[PDB]
């Protein structure tokens, strides 16, 4: 797997996933606050680190000592003697504003989640970082709070500097900040951060994002099939449980011609989006080229005219992935859909997908914050 | 919760004589399905009942239809199929 040099799991005011946390009480990280335990307990919610919170009456800044590199940074919030609705604030790092005018409650129950986790990918030069929480001065009621904080080392996994590799569906990633908004194991089960390949990313089942009743079928690899990452490829790109499970359209070819396998993802407007799609041919029937060929549409437009996973990989059960950039038409629904391409006469009319990762790309140099979700 | 409505003795010609062939045209087939099942939108839409599964069973039995054609190719909007 990947072993991160830094694994700072910080619980504020001090789990079900075998990870040890640390209170922020005597932390060198702390640089005043009014620690309080959570007012109400929801069985669906785990105590650590959701139950304990630290509240910032006035601006607060957190510091962590880190080597030069890119880090996952994940905030943990659970909306809850102050009143929960009146919490509006901003969170900043370096020249990057991670959050602004943010409400944990209006965000959380618009989405029918008890608690929220927010994920960022940021590059840090130097040995220190800027984590500042600021209660919005705009209304007076407004305060800030954080249940917990994770900072995790990370390779430069999601950047596409190489020349002409990425263009939008109609682009350069280097020392830009990304916020992860979706991470799905398509046709598979949830994957807890322990069960990730050492990067502690949560993978969620994709089915709640299917548009209608059109689920096709889920596929899993055969037992005598071995997922082999290509030689010279990092094996922590996604868990084997992501590439061993996939979703496809169904056993009937003419039926698969009449519908798209579709997913929809609500996104913030005004940004551009990195969409990493994850592939691995798990079917025993598909072993040669021109058997399964399909078109990928992103936001009702074509991102890939003809996707043949064998042409991408030359064999069964070998993972692969591809990055795209979607620039939405200016809080919004992002469409993903696949359809079979029958031009060139493939053996089967079908489509396939193993995993999805969508990140919000920081605009210019500046904001990664979007509007608060109207429920 | 056995279905309130009886689906055994209903007249499935609405579907069988329109949704056909080796190709199951999405528009024709979804029009036919709506025509047949919109008058029972109330009972089908209720999760507690045993009716929707019983209905699809009969639809697929009298039509010899492939496995999930209606779920897969019938979609309209976020709300569902209009039926008005």
């Amino acid at each position: 797997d990947y072993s991160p040099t830094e694994k700072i799991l910080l619980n504020c005011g001090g789990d079900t996933d075998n990870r040890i946390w640390i209170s922020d009480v005597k932390s060198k990280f702390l640089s005043d606050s009014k620690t309080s335990p959570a007012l109400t307990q929801d069985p669906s919610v785990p105590e650590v680190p959701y139950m304990t919170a630290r509240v910032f009456r006035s601006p607060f800044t957190y510091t962590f000592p880190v080597a030069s590199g890119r880090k996952f940074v994940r905030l943990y919030f659970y909306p809850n003697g102050l009143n929960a609705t009146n919490s509006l604030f901003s969170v900043s790092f370096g020249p990057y504003t991670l959050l602004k005018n943010f409400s944990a409650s209006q965000t959380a129950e618009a989405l029918t989640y008890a608690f929220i986790i927010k994920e960022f990918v940021v590059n840090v030069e130097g040995g220190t970082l800027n984590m500042t929480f600021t209660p919005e001065s705009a209304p007076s009621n407004a305060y800030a709070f954080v249940n917990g904080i994770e900072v995790t080392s990370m390779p430069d996994m999601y950047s596409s500097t190489d020349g002409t590799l990425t263009m939008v569906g109609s682009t350069i990633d280097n020392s830009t900040a990304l916020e992860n908004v979706y991470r799905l194991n398509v046709g598979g089960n949830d994957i807890s951060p322990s069960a990730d390949t050492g990067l502690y990313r949560s993978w969620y089942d994709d089915q709640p994002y299917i548009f209608g009743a059109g689920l096709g079928i889920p596929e899993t690899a055969d037992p005598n099939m071995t997922i082999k990452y290509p030689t010279g490829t990092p094996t922590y790109v996604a868990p084997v449980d992501v590439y061993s499970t996939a979703r496809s359209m169904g056993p009937t070819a003419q039926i698969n011609l009449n519908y798209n396998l579709t997913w929809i993802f609500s996104i913030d407007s005004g940004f551009t989006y990195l969409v990493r799609l994850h592939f691995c041919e798990v079917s025993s029937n598909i072993t040669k080229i021109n058997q399964r060929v399909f078109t990928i549409y992103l936001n009702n437009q074509t991102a890939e005219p003809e996707a043949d996973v064998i042409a991408w990989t030359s064999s069964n059960g070998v993972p692969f992935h591809k990055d795209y950039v979607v620039n939405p038409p200016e809080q919004q629904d992002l469409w993903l859909a696949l359809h079979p391409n029958p031009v060139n006469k493939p053996e089967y009319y079908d489509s396939l997908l193993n995993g999805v990762e969508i990140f919000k790309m920081n605009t210019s140099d500046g904001n990664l914050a979007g509007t608060n979700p109207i429920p | 919760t056995t279905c309130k409505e009886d689906f055994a003795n209903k007249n499935y010609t609405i579907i069988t004589s329109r949704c056909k062939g080796p190709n199951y045209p999405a528009n024709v087939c979804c029009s036919a399905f709506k025509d047949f099942a919109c008058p029972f939108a109330e009972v089908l839409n209720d999760e507690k009942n045993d009716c929707a599964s019983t209905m699809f069973s009969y639809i697929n039995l009298y039509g010899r239809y492939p496995p999930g054609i209606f779920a897969n190719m019938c979609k309209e909007g976020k709300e569902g199929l209009d039926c008005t």
């Binding site: 009743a213 689920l215 | 099942a37 939108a41 699809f56 054609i69 569902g80 199929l81 039926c83």
Partner: peptide
């Protein structure tokens, strides 16, 4: 009124 996708999902493909 609508035919809900929950009802349509009763036509989901099995193994």
């Amino acid at each position: 009124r609508y035919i809900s996708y929950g009802a349509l999902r009763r036509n989901t493909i099995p193994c």
